[PDB]
Design a protein around this motif. Structure first.
Motif, short mmCIF file in Angstrom:
data_model
loop_
_atom_site.label_atom_id
_atom_site.label_comp_id
_atom_site.label_asym_id
_atom_site.label_seq_id
_atom_site.Cartn_x
_atom_site.Cartn_y
_atom_site.Cartn_z
N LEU A 286 2.01 1.97 -3.08
CA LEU A 286 1.13 2.30 -4.40
C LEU A 286 0.32 3.67 -3.96
CD1 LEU A 286 -2.10 0.17 -4.20
CD2 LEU A 286 -0.69 0.68 -6.49
N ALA A 287 0.81 4.63 -2.89
CA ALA A 287 0.85 5.46 -2.51
C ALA A 287 2.05 6.43 -2.87
CB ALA A 287 0.60 5.91 -0.98
N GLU B 205 1.70 9.64 -5.33
CA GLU B 205 1.76 10.61 -4.95
C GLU B 205 1.60 11.15 -3.71
OE1 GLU B 205 5.17 13.34 -7.70
OE2 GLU B 205 3.12 13.08 -8.78
N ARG B 206 0.59 10.35 -3.05
CA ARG B 206 -0.14 10.36 -2.34
C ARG B 206 0.68 10.16 -0.80
NH1 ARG B 206 -5.60 10.86 -2.35
NH2 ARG B 206 -5.97 9.35 -0.48
N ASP C 92 -1.07 9.43 2.86
CA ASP C 92 -0.99 7.51 3.19
C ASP C 92 0.41 7.19 3.31
OD1 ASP C 92 -3.71 8.34 3.15
OD2 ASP C 92 -3.78 7.70 0.99
N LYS D 238 0.78 -1.29 0.25
CA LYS D 238 -0.19 0.17 -0.36
C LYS D 238 1.15 1.75 -0.06
#
Ligand code: CA
Ligand code: CA
Ligand code: CL
Ligand code: CL
Ligand code: CL
Ligand code: CL
Lengths: 229, 228
Positions: free
Chosen positions: A12-13, A17-18, A21, A9
């Motif tokens: 993925l984040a 570009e999150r 998270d 995860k």
């Protein structure tokens, strides 16, 4: 919230570009108590660099706008917004520093890991120092310097001059001298000897690390040129 | 609290690249019920563009990773993260759309503004459509088309072909036809006629707005050659 699941995860984040998270994922991974791998360590590092970085970038813009205003209504707004950004920034730095004291530094079973986390400790106290008022500041600045110094000594004893972590520590440590302590002279000599000792090492590089090492060397020399204009 | 104070805070937020703050400031300015100035309209638009756009950008990366994999564990991660991102995106779009319906479109007292906000309604229904997968899609696509169409009718009647908002509408509506309605011929036709009409009326171009107009014309033609 499984270790592999959280790491997946986080990756993925990262691609999304999150970074909030991403940091949240690697925070909970770190809190499981086990020693982080090279991969996980880098994910944690990248996440928080981006999370704090956004606030540091905002802080510099808002702070500069405060300084460039000659009335009381506009300044008080810039001031109050800087202070809002500052508390966010301090909350993030103290999150990272807590993770460093409670889990990361204690479990670091190798010199590499130790130096990496002590550099990181130096960095996040340095970011608190950029934003310090002055009373607390001297104590903040000493924490930063002690972290960097312990890291510097382990790196000299246990790593080759071309190692990217050792070079990266030299870069950050030199930036600390220039920007926090206001000593161009100490900053330059730290950066210069790191560059020269790395240049001197003959075939000490390996296929994995050579790109990062030579890039940091370039950044060391760039700082030398800037600082003696 | 004061209108001018919120607008100044929004301008601070913009400089700081803190777009959620910017969007919150301009939302509450909109909620005070007065017709927004051109500066305020643009601040609202930029703010939400960046708030929704970050989610759109994230959505496309996570969709692309979901598609590029067939691992059972990894595909289910991507899907659930896409869905998390989608509900954020839908909430943003629904906030903008309710501001448009309740305040901005009804208060618009110039054709320029009406076209701008109807175009904006088209844009945000289009962003819902990009993510629409279920039977909801056809209704949303229709909502987008009708807003764009009404904006198109008014711009054609009230605004010059070189006007940046007219050109901007033609660009976005052509993109809608291509990307949502899978209709390249309608997209090319819309873009080409908008380009050609603007070329024909280069006499009626303003010194304040010519840079924007000629930039948008270049984008229309870039799409023509791309879609050809
Ligand atoms: Ca974020
Ligand atoms: Ca933000
Ligand atoms: Cl995030
Ligand atoms: Cl982010
Ligand atoms: Cl924000
Ligand atoms: Cl943002």
């Amino acid at each position: 919230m499984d270790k592999n699941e959280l790491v997946q995860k986080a990756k993925l984040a990262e691609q999304a570009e999150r970074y909030d998270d991403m940091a949240a994922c690697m925070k909970s991974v770190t809190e499981q108590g086990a020693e982080l791998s090279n991969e996980e360590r880098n994910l944690l590092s990248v996440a928080y660099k981006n999370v704090v970085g956004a606030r540091r970038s905002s802080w510099r813009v808002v702070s500069s706008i405060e300084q460039k205003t000659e009335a009381e209504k506009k300044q008080q707004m810039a001031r109050e917004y800087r202070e809002k950004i500052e508390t966010e920034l301090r909350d993030i730095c103290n999150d990272v520093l807590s993770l460093l004291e409670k889990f990361l530094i204690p479990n670091a079973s190798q010199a590499e890991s130790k130096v990496f986390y002590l550099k990181m400790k130096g960095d996040y106290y340095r970011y608190l120092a950029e934003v310090a008022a002055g009373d607390d500041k001297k104590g903040i600045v000493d924490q930063s310097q002690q972290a960097y110094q312990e890291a510097f000594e382990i790196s000299k004893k246990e790593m080759q001059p071309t190692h990217p972590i050792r070079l990266g520590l030299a870069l950050n440590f030199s930036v600390f001298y220039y920007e926090i302590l206001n000593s161009p002279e100490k900053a330059c000599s730290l950066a210069k000897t790191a560059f020269d000792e790395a240049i001197a090492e003959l075939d000490t590089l390996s296929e994995e690390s050579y790109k990062d090492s030579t890039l940091i060397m370039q950044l060391l020399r760039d700082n030398l040129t800037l600082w003696t204009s």
